[PDB]
């Protein structure tokens, strides 16, 4: 925040910026899921290895 | 890394491995919830700018 800059921008530009946050968030969420896949697989494998 | 992690896990009991497994998803979801809140905050100055026109 950042408002002091954003307030000077057109509505179209603000619309574009707000929209850009969605795929950005989704990328972060996917990376998080992938991080947990890396934790989950070896636990499952360890269980199946006994 | 991955090899050291598997080496560690293979020495745990089945009971502790199952506990660790079931703990993963709730933990993941906590992190995702916190993430979504952070983005709510990121949107706010843009939302306010739109509304200050």
Curated annotation (Swiss-Prot), chain A:
Q: In the record, which positions carry Phosphoserine?
A: 10
**Entry superkingdom:** Eukaryota
Q: What residue stretches are annotated with the SARAH domain? A: 3-50
Coiled-coil annotation reads 8-41
**Name of protein:** Serine/threonine-protein kinase 3 20kDa subunit
Q: What is the lineage of its organism?
A: Eukaryota, Metazoa, Chordata, Craniata, Vertebrata
| Gene field | STK3
The shown residues of the full protein are 436 to 484 of 491
């Amino acid at each position: 925040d950042d408002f002091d800059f954003l307030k000077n921008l057109s509505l179209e530009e603000l619309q574009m910026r707000l929209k850009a946050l969605d795929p950005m968030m989704e990328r972060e969420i996917e990376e998080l899921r992938q991080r947990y896949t890396a934790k989950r697989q070896p636990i499952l494998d360890a269980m199946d290895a006994k």
